[PDB]
Design a protein around this nucleic acid. Structure first.
Ligand SMILES: [Mg+2]
Ligand SMILES: [Mg+2]
Length: 87
RNA sequence: GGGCGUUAAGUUGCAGGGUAUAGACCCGAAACCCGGUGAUCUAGCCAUGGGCAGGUUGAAGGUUGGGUAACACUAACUGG
């Protein structure tokens, strides 16, 4: 992804606006790339070698978001509402 | 020599028998051809109007809920 977009992402979700490694930040970067890449997998439908990378991104987002749900329930609920994931 | 001939009355009427061509002693076909009349029944078509009580199951979809990274997928209701 582009450097201005990731700088936007860490500025809108960051702890100290430098850290780039927090769980909210990693889920925000993952969801930005997933909702950008759905447009690729709507026009190219036989693109399985990148569809696997999308499935990796999905599973990794789900692992981080489950760790957030175990860690802070209030932070997880406000984060899933701020992003716009369903569950 | 043989074949055909010679010495033997025809012709015009009228009546009659027969013949010929005409329908030819009468009645009787399926049929063929030429010219018209018919699509007020029926076959199809075109244009234009009309008719089909009632009562059933309940397809496509559409909402909502769940599910899916998003669909696909699924239950409830609506649908007709
Ligand atoms: Mg990665
Ligand atoms: Mg007529």
């Amino acid at each position: 992804l582009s450097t201005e977009a990731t700088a936007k992402i860490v500025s809108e979700f960051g702890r100290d606006a430098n850290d780039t490694g927090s769980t909210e930040v990693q889920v925000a970067l993952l969801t930005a790339q997933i909702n950008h890449l759905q447009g690729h997998f709507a026009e190219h439908k036989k693109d399985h070698h990148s569809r696997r990378g999308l499935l990796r991104m999905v599973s990794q987002r789900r692992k981080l978001l489950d760790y957030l749900k175990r860690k802070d329930v209030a932070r997880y609920t406000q984060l899933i509402e701020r992003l716009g994931l369903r569950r």
